[PDB]
Amino acid sequence: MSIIAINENGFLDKIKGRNPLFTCVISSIETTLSIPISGVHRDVIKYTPSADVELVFYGKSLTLKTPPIDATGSPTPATITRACVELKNIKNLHIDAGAFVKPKIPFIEIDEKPTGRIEEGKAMNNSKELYMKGYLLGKNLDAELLIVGESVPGGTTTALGVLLGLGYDAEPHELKIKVVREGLKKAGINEKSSVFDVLNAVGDKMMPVVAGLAISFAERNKPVILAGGTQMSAVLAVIKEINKKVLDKNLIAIGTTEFVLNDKKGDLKGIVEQIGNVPVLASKFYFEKAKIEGLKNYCKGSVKEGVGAGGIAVYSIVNDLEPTKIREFIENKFYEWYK
Amino acid sequence: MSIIAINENGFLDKIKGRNPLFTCVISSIETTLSIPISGVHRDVIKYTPSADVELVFYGKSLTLKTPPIDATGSPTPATITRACVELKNIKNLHIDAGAFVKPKIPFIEIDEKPTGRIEEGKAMNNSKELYMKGYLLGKNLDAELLIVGESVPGGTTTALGVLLGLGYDAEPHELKIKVVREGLKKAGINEKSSVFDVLNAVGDKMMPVVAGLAISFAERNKPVILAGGTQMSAVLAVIKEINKKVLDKNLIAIGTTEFVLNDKKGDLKGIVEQIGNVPVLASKFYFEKAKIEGLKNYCKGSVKEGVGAGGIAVYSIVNDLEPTKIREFIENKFYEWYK
């Protein structure tokens, strides 16, 4: 009941009681090394996606030694995901699709090379192969429910490129749009372009992998929560163009945070509307009824989501986790760190 | 009933009907590049472990383009494993623990660096960390039953080193024993040595990973089939010294081929006897009632086992697979290849 639900279509009943697998797909983008399309600082951006999944899987990052909660009590999104993993004993297994630095936990290697130069239109040359790798991997994972998140610094830009390239209406932000517009041009994207032509131009390698995993579960009549926001709407668009029919089973949902579902300029629901009547679910954290400033002002400043935090919280709450156990886990971890 | 069973202890009843996960742990050993302790030829030995798991997971190897069945009809062990995977729809996911060349299928990366120089006593420096990585990975895999095989060229030597080092009585073969005897000496293995001191001296990186995975399943009261022969007996010895108590649950078995269970000089049952009353199971292939020579003479020449072929066949037959469907799968694949 701490869950928002747009076009629910029964989906919450399907995920109740199901044993889940949580997986985060990570990648890096060459563009982000010289064009500030990501908020992640240049001196940590190479380490950041692997540090996220290390924290979720092991409980702390192993190369980045920066605290996961800052001095004001503001948690990184991976900290929220880790809270749900610990509180609800969520099995988790993470996939690399080209992060600059590889995790030091066990991880599934799907592609060692990073996503390329978006502005040159040279994101990928293998999106179709990445999709089939994601599909065959998905066939070999055994769970009642797939929760799949992402951690790609700069993935809001590639998700804009893909939503535009497939024809959708999706509109700092001025620089994001120059990068993709130039990329779609320099790779000659027309309207007879395939979804793989568009991914190869301006996508990120996470998107075809996640699409592959989602379709393989939805084909076997198993629910999928795409745990993210804008980046996940681009994956949904990819799915529709690959296997439109399985979208209609109403087994693929989008899980995000309340902070994303009401973003002034974001309009996640505007995007999903153009794609289809897909369930969209947000989790309520009640961070404002909290002691520390960073947690209390969490809804302000940056739109806060990542590493499947929103979507795994949706699953956790729907399965009887008191929502404020998340807040108190973070608070207890804050005071253990001392900063 | 095409299953041999020594000290069955009820184990076959536990695995009937269980949904399995099959996983192969691969590694390479620096020793094998300059000392002929492996039968695998020097010009394919770097490619061979990854080619095995590619074949099991995808249905063909992707860098080694040599046929998986030779011109006389003799199948590689990975071909038998792939037969069971296809016929019984076995979910499979493979782990790298230092193979020279990495698989081109998705795979779990646990350690990129190969096992070191056995004869120098420098196999590993991280066996305890590899074990915990295997244990934490195992906690995050969801199946009713674990079938875990191996593919390590030269692993018969490291398994001799470990069985000797832990004090067991385990005795071409003359050169294997010089390599390990020198390794145990040059690393000063005494009788106050830990199991991790011995693995760090003359083990292979597959052994602590597999031990970690086995114990994590057996602790949650789930059966494990250690799918191999002599190499797997060394893993059982490692397990006993790490967590002797979970051995007694009678949830960890050894699955191998009939060709291994009756090897003149091997004596698998002699080894397992010194370790404990562990179930040992062999699968019957009836390759002698076959047309092609290589399949008909399969019991002759080389002791034939690898890539969990024996153990996954045990699981498959016990769950109602007609044993000669394996033979006919290989025969049909032989004639498709034409060689």
Author numbering:
A (entry chain A), B (entry chain A): 1 to 171, 182 to 349
Task: Quote the study that presented this structure, word for word.
Cobamides (Cbas) are coenzymes used by cells across all domains of life, but de novo synthesis is only found in some bacteria and archaea. Base activation is catalyzed by a phosphoribosyltransferase (PRTase). To gain insights into the mechanism of base activation by the PRTase from Methanocaldococcus jannaschii (MjCobT), we solved crystal structures of the enzyme in complex with substrate and products.
None of the structures described here contain a free base, although they were present in all crystallization experiments. This is true for the apo structure, which contains no ligands in the active site. Superposition of these two structures shows that significant changes occur in the loops extending from Ile 37 to Ile 45, Ser 293 to Lys 314, and Pro 333 to Tyr 348, such that the active site of the apo structure is open to solvent in contrast to that of the complex with either NaMN or α-RP and nicotinic acid. The rms difference between these two structures is 0.94 Å for 329 equivalent residues, indicating the significant conformational changes that occur when substrates bind. Strikingly, residues Lys 173 to Asn 181 that were disordered in the apo structure became ordered upon ligand binding and contribute to the distal component of the binding pocket for the nitrogenous base. Altogether, the movement of the surface loops serves to close the active site on substrate binding.
